[PDB]
Design a protein around this ligand. Structure first.
Ligand SMILES: CC(=O)N[C@@H]1[C@@H](O)[C@H](O)[C@@H](CO)O[C@H]1O
Ligand SMILES: CC(=O)N[C@@H]1[C@@H](O)[C@H](O)[C@@H](CO)O[C@H]1O
Ligand SMILES: CC(=O)N[C@@H]1[C@@H](O)[C@H](O)[C@@H](CO)O[C@H]1O
Ligand SMILES: CC(=O)N[C@@H]1[C@@H](O)[C@H](O)[C@@H](CO)O[C@H]1O
Ligand SMILES: *[C@@H]1O[C@H](CO)[C@@H](O)[C@H](O)[C@H]1NC(C)=O
Ligand SMILES: *[C@@H]1O[C@H](CO)[C@@H](O)[C@H](O)[C@H]1NC(C)=O
Ligand SMILES: *[C@@H]1O[C@H](CO)[C@@H](O)[C@H](O)[C@H]1NC(C)=O
Ligand SMILES: *[C@@H]1O[C@H](CO)[C@@H](O)[C@H](O)[C@H]1NC(C)=O
Ligand SMILES: *[C@@H]1O[C@H](CO)[C@@H](O)[C@H](O)[C@H]1NC(C)=O
Ligand SMILES: *[C@@H]1O[C@H](CO)[C@@H](O)[C@H](O)[C@H]1NC(C)=O
Ligand SMILES: *[C@@H]1O[C@H](CO)[C@@H](O)[C@H](O)[C@H]1NC(C)=O
Ligand SMILES: *[C@@H]1O[C@H](CO)[C@@H](O)[C@H](O)[C@H]1NC(C)=O
Ligand SMILES: *[C@@H]1O[C@H](CO)[C@@H](O)[C@H](O)[C@H]1NC(C)=O
Ligand SMILES: *[C@@H]1O[C@H](CO)[C@@H](O)[C@H](O)[C@H]1NC(C)=O
Ligand SMILES: *[C@@H]1O[C@H](CO)[C@@H](O)[C@H](O)[C@H]1NC(C)=O
Ligand SMILES: *[C@@H]1O[C@H](CO)[C@@H](O)[C@H](O)[C@H]1NC(C)=O
Lengths: 135, 135, 135, 135
């Protein structure tokens, strides 16, 4: 890829920003831009293109064949008991979190048993992430 | 991809922003822009293009064949009991969270047993994420 | 890739930013830009292109064959009990977190048993990450 | 890759930034830029290109064959009990964290049993990371 940018606050080509408590007086700003961009991206120039997938089974004897794809989960267990017993007591809870299997982003591409792929694949993630804020 | 940008606050090409408590006086701003963009993206220039998938089964004997695709979940268990017993007691709870299997984004593409793919695939995620804010 | 940038606060080509408590007086700014960009990225110039995958099974005898793809999870167990017993007691909790299996980003590409791939693959992640902030 | 940059605060080509408590007076700034960039990246110039994968099974006898892909997890156990007993006692907790299996970023590419790959692969990660901040 081209021009993949994370900018926290502010982006510009030409900036004349003026901040608090300023005396901006008697200024002459002269700007003469010639900014040209020419892109040629993922361009195929092919006379003859042949792409294929072939699966042939002849005079075979197949018996007792097991295929299991990825991400197989079996006999998983989560046990998070919470017991609170109080007797003539004081208790104060502020900003208490019990998190089990919390997900923000899941991107899945070409998760298979068999794949044949011709071409371009991309995954882009940009974020600002903040889980707990309790001030 | 081209020009994938995360900007937290502010974006511009030319900015003359003026902030609080300012004296902007007697200013001459002269701007002369020539900004041209020429894009040629994912362009195929092919005389002959042949693409195919072929699956042939001849004089075969298949018996007792099991195929299982991905993301198989079996015998999963979540146990999150909460017991609160009070006797002549005080209790204050503020901003209490029990989260089990919480998801924000799930993007799935080409999740299969068998795939044949010709071309372009993309996934883009941009976000600002904040789970808990209790001040 | 080209031009993959993480900028924490501010980006520019030409900046004349002025900050707090300033006397900007009697300034002459003259700017003459010729900024051109020519990109030729992922460009195929091929007369003849032949790409294929072939799987042939002849006069074979297959028996008792097991294939298991990746990321297989079996007999996993999480046990996080919390017991609080109080008797004529004081207790104050602020900003308490129990986290089990917390995920922010999961990107999966070509997670398979068998793969044949022709071309370009990319994964880009940009972030600002902050788990706990309790001041 | 080309031009992969991590910039903590500020980026520019030409900067005339002025900070707090300044007297910027009687300044003449003259800038004459000729900045051109020519890129030719991942460019194939091939007369004849032949790429393929072939798997042939003839007159073979296969029996009792087990293949297991990577990242196999079996009989994993986590035990994190927390017991608090109080009797005529004072207890104050601030900014307490129990973390089990916490993940920020997971990028997976070509995690398979068998792979044949022709071309370009890339993974880029840029971040600012902060786990706990409790002042
Ligand atoms: C030819 C062959 O393999 N046959 C078996 C059979 O004997 C068995 O009872 C059944 C149960 O899994 O599976 C199949
Ligand atoms: C030819 C062959 O392998 N047959 C077996 C069979 O004897 C067994 O009872 C069954 C259960 O797994 O699996 C299959
Ligand atoms: C030809 C051969 O190897 N057969 C064996 C069989 O005797 C055994 O009972 C089974 C269990 O693992 O595995 C297979
Ligand atoms: C030819 C062969 O290997 N057959 C075996 C069979 O004897 C066994 O009972 C079964 C259970 O795993 O697995 C298969
Ligand atoms: C600004 O420039 C003009 C022209 O040179 C001049 O007459 C004027 O007095 C100046 N002002 C200040 C505040 O110096
Ligand atoms: C600005 O740019 C153009 C193109 O290069 C040039 O011909 C023109 O004379 C320039 N003008 C000034 C004021 O410098
Ligand atoms: C593309 O292919 C043709 C045939 O070989 C060639 O004559 C032509 O100049 C090429 N053009 C580009 C832009 O590469
Ligand atoms: C601003 O510029 C004009 C023209 O040069 C001048 O007459 C005027 O007095 C200036 N004002 C200040 C506040 O200096
Ligand atoms: C601005 O740009 C054009 C194109 O380059 C140029 O011909 C023109 O003279 C410029 N004008 C000024 C005031 O510089
Ligand atoms: C595309 O293909 C034709 C045939 O080879 C060629 O003559 C032509 O110049 C090409 N054009 C471009 C824009 O690549
Ligand atoms: C700024 O420049 C002008 C022109 O040279 C001059 O007349 C003016 O008095 C200057 N102002 C200050 C504050 O020196
Ligand atoms: C600015 O750039 C153009 C292109 O190089 C040049 O022809 C022009 O004379 C320049 N103008 C000035 C004021 O220097
Ligand atoms: C591409 O291929 C053709 C055929 O060999 C050649 O004549 C042409 O000059 C090439 N063009 C480029 C841009 O590489
Ligand atoms: C700045 O420059 C001008 C021109 O040389 C001059 O007349 C003016 O008095 C100067 N101002 C100061 C503050 O020295
Ligand atoms: C700036 O750059 C151009 C291109 O090299 C040159 O022809 C022009 O004379 C320059 N202008 C000045 C003021 O130096
Ligand atoms: C690419 O290949 C052709 C054929 O050999 C050659 O004539 C041409 O000059 C090449 N062009 C480039 C840009 O390498």
């Amino acid at each position: 890829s081209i021009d993949v940018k994370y900018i926290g606050v502010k982006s510009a080509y030409v900036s004349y920003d003026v901040q608090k408590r300023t005396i901006y007086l008697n200024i002459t700003n002269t700007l003469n831009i010639t900014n040209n961009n020419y892109y040629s991206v993922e361009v195929e120039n092919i006379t003859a293109q042949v792409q294929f997938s072939k699966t042939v089974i002849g005079k075979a004897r197949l018996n007792n064949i097991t295929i299991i794809g990825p991400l197989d989960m079996k006999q998983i267990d989560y046990t998070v008991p919470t017991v609170i017993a109080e007797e003539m007591s004081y208790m104060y809870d502020f900003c208490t979190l019990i998190s089990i299997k919390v997900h923000n982003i899941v991107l899945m591409m070409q998760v298979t048993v068999t794949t044949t792929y011709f071409g371009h694949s991309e995954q882009i993630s940009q974020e600002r992430y903040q889980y707990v804020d309790c001030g």
